[PDB]
């Protein structure tokens, strides 16, 4: 094949073609004059195996993916700058144009709106990357410089770590995003197609459909906000408007939310000295709250007590009544504790 | 039993004055393991026990059912 074919080999070759009356020979007038051309052919070979690289879909090139995507659709991302605020410390009433340019290191920042220094607006004004990149996400507390001195300003720090700061999609990454829409379509039944759509709201981060919930063809859409804390009323609307825009033919789509349980609670118990009952009272409603977080199931009594008993400032404590009762709170699906009563009596 | 063992032991060690009966109770929650306990009681009672002078705790029986 092409890594047999070179030039001493066509040489050969060529020279058994040619039967000719002069005897052939090394340093010959006609064997230099085919050795050039299959030097030539030699070159074109090699040309002709890259020709099956290049035209290979695999380990492509920019300009051979970005043909290849536009033909498919997928067309590559080029990355997002990053976005920030920092905070303009200096003279007060110095004021800063919009467009001027600060600089961290090496790197490169631009202000957006226009900020003044002791202005009742604040001194905090968003900046964003001149550049995409992750080099352009600045942690916080980053001592920002002016690339052009302005009078009125001495320094300048972000109080917010800068974020939105995207590096180019490679061409490998797009590659396995393109192969995995291909082996996956959007179905009407498949939970993960139709909660794909719901994840694509911000405010909401798991998803839930039950089906058969109404009679036949019936889908119940379930979502948790943040930490299964219940999103907003226009939030709960719009994505019910986006999943009906990709919702299947004939469905009926209902969305629910988080319902909070309130809790009351009341108990007997012995202060320790230097403590009183404010200081236990928020120490245990913060640890109750964690409790609540990270309770899957029932309400536990035993496990609310001992959140009491090692809340400090807790010596004695007796006749610890929850809702009414001391036996273990079931909670319902969907469904999360929230304090509301603390009866706490030494 | 073991874990409860060690860990009122450790209380034991770290006690003074009188054992209480509410932090046996949450020693024994906070033990790993433990998911809902009840009608707990020291020497038959939940009423706190004065420790005097040269006498400690000593555990001589444990109970514990599902």
């Given at each position: 094949?092409?890594?047999?074919?070179?030039?001493?080999?066509?040489?050969?070759?060529?020279?058994?073609?040619?039967?000719?009356?002069?005897?052939?020979?090394?340093?010959?007038?006609?064997?230099?004059?085919?050795?050039?051309?299959?030097?030539?052919?030699?070159?074109?070979?090699?040309?002709?195996?890259?020709?099956?690289?290049?035209?290979?879909?695999?380990?492509?090139?920019?300009?051979?993916?970005?043909?290849?995507?536009?033909?498919?659709?997928?067309?590559?991302?080029?990355?997002?700058?990053?976005?920030?605020?920092?905070?303009?410390?200096?003279?007060?009433?110095?004021?800063?144009?919009?467009?001027?340019?600060?600089?961290?290191?090496?790197?490169?920042?631009?202000?957006?709106?226009?900020?003044?220094?002791?202005?009742?607006?604040?001194?905090?004004?968003?900046?964003?990357?001149?550049?995409?990149?992750?080099?352009?996400?600045?942690?916080?507390?980053?001592?920002?410089?002016?690339?052009?001195?302005?009078?009125?300003?001495?320094?300048?720090?972000?109080?917010?770590?800068?974020?939105?700061?995207?590096?180019?999609?490679?061409?490998?990454?797009?590659?396995?995003?393109?192969?995995?829409?291909?082996?996956?379509?959007?179905?009407?039944?498949?939970?993960?197609?139709?909660?794909?759509?719901?994840?694509?709201?911000?405010?909401?981060?798991?998803?839930?459909?039950?089906?058969?919930?109404?009679?036949?063809?019936?889908?119940?859409?379930?979502?948790?906000?943040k930490n299964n804390q219940?999103?907003?009323?226009?939030?709960?609307?719009?994505?019910?408007?986006?999943?009906?825009?990709?919702?299947?033919?004939?469905?009926?789509?209902?969305?629910?939310?988080?319902?909070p349980i309130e809790i009351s609670i009341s108990a007997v118990m012995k202060l320790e000295d230097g403590y009183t009952l404010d200081n236990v009272k928020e120490s245990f409603l913060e640890s109750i709250n964690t409790y609540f977080r990270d309770i899957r199931g029932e309400i536990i009594y035993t496990k609310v007590m001992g959140i009491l008993i090692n809340t400090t400032g807790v010596h004695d404590l007796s006749n610890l009544l929850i809702n009414?009762s001391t036996d273990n709170i079931?909670i319902?699906?969907?469904k999360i504790p929230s304090v509301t009563t603390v009866n706490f009596s030494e």
């Amino acid at each position: 094949m092409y890594s047999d074919q070179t030039y001493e080999v066509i040489k050969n070759r060529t020279l058994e073609n040619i039967n000719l009356d002069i005897y052939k020979g090394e340093g010959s007038f006609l064997n230099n004059m085919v050795s050039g051309n299959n030097l030539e052919l030699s070159k074109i070979y090699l040309e002709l195996s890259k020709m099956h690289k290049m035209a290979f879909i695999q380990d492509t090139y920019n300009q051979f993916l970005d043909k290849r995507v536009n033909e498919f659709g997928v067309y590559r991302k080029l990355g997002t700058e990053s976005n920030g605020e920092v905070e303009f410390i200096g003279e007060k009433g110095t004021v800063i144009n919009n467009g001027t340019i600060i600089s961290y290191r090496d790197l490169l920042f631009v202000v957006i709106k226009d900020v003044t220094i002791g202005s009742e607006e604040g001194d905090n004004s968003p900046v964003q990357a001149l550049e995409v990149g992750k080099k352009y996400n600045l942690p916080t507390n980053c001592e920002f410089k002016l690339v052009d001195n302005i009078s009125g300003v001495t320094k300048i720090t972000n109080t917010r770590s800068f974020e939105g700061g995207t590096d180019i999609e490679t061409d490998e990454e797009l590659k396995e995003r393109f192969y995995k829409i291909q082996r996956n379509q959007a179905t009407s039944g498949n939970k993960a197609h139709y909660e794909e759509w719901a994840l694509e709201v911000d405010g909401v981060y798991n998803v839930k459909v039950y089906p058969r919930w109404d009679g036949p063809g019936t889908v119940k859409v379930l979502i948790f906000g943040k930490n299964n804390q219940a999103v907003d009323t226009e939030t709960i609307e719009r994505c019910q408007q986006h999943i009906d825009e990709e919702k299947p033919i004939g469905p009926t789509i209902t969305v629910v939310t988080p319902l909070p349980i309130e809790i009351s609670i009341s108990a007997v118990m012995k202060l320790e000295d230097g403590y009183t009952l404010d200081n236990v009272k928020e120490s245990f409603l913060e640890s109750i709250n964690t409790y609540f977080r990270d309770i899957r199931g029932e309400i536990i009594y035993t496990k609310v007590m001992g959140i009491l008993i090692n809340t400090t400032g807790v010596h004695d404590l007796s006749n610890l009544l929850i809702n009414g009762s001391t036996d273990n709170i079931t909670i319902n699906e969907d469904k999360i504790p929230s304090v509301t009563t603390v009866n706490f009596s030494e």
